[PDB]
Amino acid sequence: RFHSFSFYELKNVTNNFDERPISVGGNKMGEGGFGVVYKGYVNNTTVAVKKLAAITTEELKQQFDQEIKVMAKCQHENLVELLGFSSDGDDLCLVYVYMPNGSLLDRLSCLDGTPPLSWHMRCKIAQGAANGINFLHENHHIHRDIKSANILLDEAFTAKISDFGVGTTAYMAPEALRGEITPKSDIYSFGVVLLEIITGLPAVDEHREPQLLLDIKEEIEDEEKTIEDYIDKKMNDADSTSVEAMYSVASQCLHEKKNKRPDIKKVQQLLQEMTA
Amino acid sequence: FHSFSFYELKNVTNNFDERPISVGGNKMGEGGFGVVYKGYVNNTTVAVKKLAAITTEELKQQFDQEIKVMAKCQHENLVELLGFSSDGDDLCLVYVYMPNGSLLDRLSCLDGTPPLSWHMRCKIAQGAANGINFLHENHHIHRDIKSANILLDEAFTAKISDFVGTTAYMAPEALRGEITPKSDIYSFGVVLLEIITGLPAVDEHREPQLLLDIKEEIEDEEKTIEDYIDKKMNDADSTSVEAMYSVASQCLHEKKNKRPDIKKVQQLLQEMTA
Ligand SMILES: Cc1ccc(C(=O)Nc2ccc(CN3CCN(C)CC3)c(C(F)(F)F)c2)cc1C#Cc1cnc2cccnn12
Ligand SMILES: Cc1ccc(C(=O)Nc2ccc(CN3CCN(C)CC3)c(C(F)(F)F)c2)cc1C#Cc1cnc2cccnn12
Ligand SMILES: [Co+2]
Ligand SMILES: [Co+2]
Ligand SMILES: [Co+2]
Ligand SMILES: [Co+2]
């Protein structure tokens, strides 16, 4: 299943856990979630290495085992993969396969000058994220934090659902803001994600009206606006038909009432008929 | 310049097909008192403004005034007027087509074009400043300086164009009716903010709605310029970004006599490039 790494290999491969950012040539790509994450290269693969730091050194462990426990079950083309771990001396380390095209969020915003995603590619990424969510649901997992920053992209730009360390309020369904734990909340957050894919806009912008992307649904329903007004201008290949089809899916996902939202298999089917 | 027969530009524009170019028509846009069409003649891709109805002979006077000013405005950084057509009706002005469109469209990455790098943006700023400087040396006030009026050729060389004012770009004294080149400087400062941020000059749904108001926020230290930098560049170092922001801040001074003149702006952008 998992390759058992030794802490000292992981130390050597991250260049002794170089803390300088990769933009400068170091190995540190991120922080947060009770650990720092470093780019490395092991077993002929570029990898992401999360080294856990120290609150209560036993709850760290708790989280360490939990992640391995859940990641063991979750293996799918459209999920991020846990290569292995190290329970070895000094620290705890988790090793994931590195996705070189980053998050869907960064590419939608064209961070660092990457070219804009085409509509074809956007459609395929939506289908893939839907498939990964479907795997999570079929096997009785709730993601509880679906967002564009939790969708990574590999060399081929295939969607890989991730969960970096109760959710993100700009993506949260009303019932989830009230404490309910259900997959239908995942479907709602995914509807927000589809709005991001269509518009290229972030989910929340404090300096924008509306501040929340989901509210554009209202503006379109009250016919103060239309979807064409919000289409990302950074594509030349987007046809009105399939854009409206994706918007329909997203709108159905964003129903305030959780039992009126489609399940993930329904979404899958609608996104299929979108490009069929 | 070249005198065209009206039927020639009619032939070359597909009889002034008014459908937009995206539909397969020839209409590039709506400017001044006429419509702008794409055409091709004499080994040159051209933009043809056909003027329409406003008193008719004042139309002819504007036509003649444009030919007179553009006839002796030939510069690397200005739009190049190729010719015209005055036989009967209508009046037509022919310019050389700029295939990379306007700075506004490229800053917004319209139709999926890649984002302009920081280096390219700096060279475009310098070129636009050179065009303004040419205009000002020859005692011309532009009166409508905006990113939509900065075109770009195959090499991304900035070309100033014109087709009163745009309120998101206007200096306070220009809003009160004054006519001075110092207003041009203020508008250029807005353009520089656009180049830094990728943001449009006005956004009705944004706080603030006017990009120029970010200066206040930065000066009132509610924010920093790094908060506003376009994310769509990987080559923007903090030093030269802050340098161009300084230039834009000086250009945006409310007191017209406290703004630098165009040559000082050229010097400052120059030093920014190092
Ligand atoms: C450091 C790191 C830590 C954790 C995870 C991670 O995604 N863990 C994960 C945990 C649980 C679940 C499923 N559960 C969710 C909770 N829910 C309550 C139950 C179901 C899933 C899921 F993928 F399946 F979704 C993933 C990924 C990375 C990464 C990475 C990485 C790889 N390449 C790059 C390139 C740039 C940045 N990162 N990066
Ligand atoms: C059709 C057309 C007509 C006119 C002009 C035009 O800019 N005329 C102009 C007239 C006067 C002046 C001088 N100022 C003196 C002081 N006066 C108060 C203001 C005026 C200047 C100036 F360049 F010098 F600025 C320019 C450009 C075009 C174009 C075009 C074109 C070509 N390719 C493309 C690609 C995309 C979009 N457009 N486009
Ligand atoms: Co604020
Ligand atoms: Co001829
Ligand atoms: Co350089
Ligand atoms: Co509104």
Curated annotation (Swiss-Prot), chain A:
- Enzyme class, first EC level, given as a word: transferase
Domain spans labelled Protein kinase: 23-271
Name what cofactor the protein needs. Mg(2+)
Its main localization is cytoplasm
Q: What is its EC number?
A: 2.7.11.1
Active site per UniProt:
145
Q: How is it modified after translation?
A: Phosphorylated.
Compartment(s): Cytoplasm
Give the Gene Ontology MF terms in alphabetical order: ATP binding; interleukin-1 receptor binding; kinase activity; magnesium ion binding; protein kinase binding; protein serine kinase activity; protein serine/threonine kinase activity
Q: Which family does it belong to?
A: Belongs to the protein kinase superfamily. TKL Ser/Thr protein kinase family. Pelle subfamily.
Q: What does this protein do?
A: Serine/threonine-protein kinase that plays a critical role in initiating innate immune response against foreign pathogens. Involved in Toll-like receptor (TLR) and IL-1R signaling pathways. Is rapidly recruited by MYD88 to the receptor-signaling complex upon TLR activation to form the Myddosome together with IRAK2. Phosphorylates initially IRAK1, thus stimulating the kinase activity and intensive autophosphorylation of IRAK1. Phosphorylates E3 ubiquitin ligases Pellino proteins (PELI1, PELI2 and PELI3) to promote pellino-mediated polyubiquitination of IRAK1.
Describe its partners and assembly state.
Associates with MYD88 and IRAK2 to form a ternary complex called the Myddosome. Once phosphorylated, IRAK4 dissociates from the receptor complex and then associates with the TNF receptor-associated factor 6 (TRAF6), IRAK1, and PELI1; this intermediate complex is required for subsequent NF-kappa-B activation. Direct binding of SMAD6 to PELI1 prevents complex formation and hence negatively regulates IL1R-TLR signaling and eventually NF-kappa-B-mediated gene expression. Interacts with IL1RL1. Interacts (when phosphorylated) with IRAK1. May interact (when phosphorylated) with IRAK3.
- Name this polypeptide is given: Interleukin-1 receptor-associated kinase 4
Supply the source organism for this entry: Homo sapiens
Lineage of origin: Eukaryota, Metazoa, Chordata, Craniata, Vertebrata
**What's the name of its gene?**
IRAK4
Q: Which stretch of the full sequence is covered here?
A: 164 to 459 of 460
Curated annotation (Swiss-Prot), chain B:
Query: Intact protein stretch covered?
Result: 165 to 459 of 460
Recorded GO cellular component terms are: cell surface; cytoplasm; cytosol; endosome membrane; extracellular space; extrinsic component of plasma membrane; nucleus; plasma membrane
Quaternary state and partners of this protein?
A: Associates with MYD88 and IRAK2 to form a ternary complex called the Myddosome. Once phosphorylated, IRAK4 dissociates from the receptor complex and then associates with the TNF receptor-associated factor 6 (TRAF6), IRAK1, and PELI1; this intermediate complex is required for subsequent NF-kappa-B activation. Direct binding of SMAD6 to PELI1 prevents complex formation and hence negatively regulates IL1R-TLR signaling and eventually NF-kappa-B-mediated gene expression. Interacts with IL1RL1. Interacts (when phosphorylated) with IRAK1. May interact (when phosphorylated) with IRAK3.
Q: Which disease is it linked to?
A: Immunodeficiency 67: An autosomal recessive primary immunodeficiency characterized by recurrent, life-threatening systemic and invasive bacterial infections beginning in infancy or early childhood.
This protein's name = Interleukin-1 receptor-associated kinase 4
Which GO terms of type biological process are on file? Answer: cytokine-mediated signaling pathway; innate immune response; interleukin-1-mediated signaling pathway; interleukin-33-mediated signaling pathway; intracellular signal transduction; JNK cascade; lipopolysaccharide-mediated signaling pathway; MyD88-dependent toll-like receptor signaling pathway
Q: Does the keyword Chaperone apply?
A: no
> What general EC class does the enzyme of this chain belong to?
transferase
Q: Where does this protein reside within or beyond the cell?
A: Cytoplasm
